[PDB]
Curated annotation (Swiss-Prot), chains A, B:
The lineage of its organism: Archaea, Methanobacteriati, Methanobacteriota, Thermococci, Thermococcales. S-adenosyl-L-methionine binds at residues 10, 87, 90, 115-116, 166, 209, 234. This is Diphthine synthase. It comes from Pyrococcus horikoshii (strain ATCC 700860 / DSM 12428 / JCM 9974 / NBRC 100139 / OT-3). Belongs to the diphthine synthase family. Its EC number is 2.1.1.98. The diphthine intermediate is not stable in vitro and readily eliminates the trimethylamino group. It is not known whether the elimination reaction also occurs physiologically. Keywords: Methyltransferase, S-adenosyl-L-methionine, Transferase.
Amino acid sequence: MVLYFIGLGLYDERDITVKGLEIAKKCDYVFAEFYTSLMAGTTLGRIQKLIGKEIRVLSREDVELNFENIVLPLAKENDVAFLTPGDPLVATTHAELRIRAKRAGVESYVIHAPSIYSAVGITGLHIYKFGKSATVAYPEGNWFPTSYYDVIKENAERGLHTLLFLDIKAEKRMYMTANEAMELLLKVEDMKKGGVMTDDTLVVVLARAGSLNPTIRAGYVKDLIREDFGDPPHILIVPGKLHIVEAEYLVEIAGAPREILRVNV
Amino acid sequence: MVLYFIGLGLYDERDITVKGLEIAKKCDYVFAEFYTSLMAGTTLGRIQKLIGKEIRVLSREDVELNFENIVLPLAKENDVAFLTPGDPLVATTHAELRIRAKRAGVESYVIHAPSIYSAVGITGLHIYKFGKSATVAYPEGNWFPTSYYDVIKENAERGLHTLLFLDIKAEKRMYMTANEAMELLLKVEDMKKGGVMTDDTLVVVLARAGSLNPTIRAGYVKDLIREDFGDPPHILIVPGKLHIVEAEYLVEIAGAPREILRVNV
Ligand SMILES: Nc1ncnc2c1ncn2[C@@H]1O[C@H](CSCC[C@H](N)C(=O)O)[C@@H](O)[C@H]1O
Ligand code: NA
């Protein structure tokens, strides 16, 4: 009579925690969703092969609207798992599902997994220096999202880094690139003109974290906006005031321009 | 010729990822450090057993001062593993170790694992609403550090949550409790009178994240300050103004008082 929210990690099926694999292996029913993020280094088959169970993949609608009609019911008489990319409660609304579980008299547990939210540490940027986070959403019709631009502004004013989750349309198989995010940022700059994002702004790109060779790059927008960072997923980071050691790492590991080593205190 | 930075996860020996365990098992030498943090739900013995390798522990001085003399030499002719609690490179100084590897002509790769930075998602608080993070340090002698107080003030002022790491004397295996942290904050409030921390301030406590049975509690300092949250480690969070969905979660899952649905939303 239990429901397990188990994270699968960043890139491939091996990013799952041992705890997660052992518990999933013994669950009667295994559900999962692959719309909140993209695990570029694996397939549904490989995950099934690793867990030894058939996995019923759910759509956003199946979850957001019928989680308690598709998953919870079985959880009352069985050990059920619900898998998700990265960590199941980071930058998703899956947390609210634990409430649905409670109201259906189902016990739920959470098994964490490596998340892009902490994996940003590989960029060399002090993780405690990150401020509010935001998402760069794809413009739709006449609707053009811009809130993420103000978030960057507020963080930068306080010298804090800004982590930018990039949009994803799983059904359309669309994964926003750091390039598309930079384009959208420049366009919003022309509108708000707050001097938040310009050709000379320093940015950091992390692509395919979790893989053995993620792409880690830092540089000025003017130089990175057209660079090829490889297959998605990508996140874009707008650093605040750098610490000298953050700069050295960006230069030594992310190929950033040597000149950023000279910080203006 | 290869150095692997492998994260051990949140609480016990099963919190390492499958990728990290397999790679660790294939390494000729395996180092670890338990000065940045400890794995409160396991032992060096249990981890050694799981990896099936002898694990040489390294002190803070071993890493910070002689990493290139103890670890890198061996990595030039073998596959070496360097294990750390949580997610690698989250501990402020570890990133520059990758620069040392580069200069020693050694290749390095990062194998991620869950970190408390993403694990706090289990509190039900939206991850994007967290602002700058801080650590609560014990006063001693004539030194009374209080920057963590200003961090809270600046985040809350912008409706952002503040993740507070509590002091730890790893070597002496001593932890600071959420209780002690709350007492310190009131003491600081009294000194700085900035109206940031009072008996009526809402806070969240997360203990033993990673365990299947963590302690998640939310309430006003006046009611939680002397509450027993159990064995360490403890994580204290000072939430900013809450979104209704966050409050409902704290109420239904963390046992927070209904009062928050009207007072803190
Ligand atoms: N391996 C990876 N590399 C780079 N960005 C990633 C990533 N995994 C997720 N993301 C980023 O996060 C977005 C999904 S947001 C959901 C995040 C997920 N629960 C987690 O814990 O990571 C993606 O569109 C992308 O911008
Ligand atoms: Na943060």
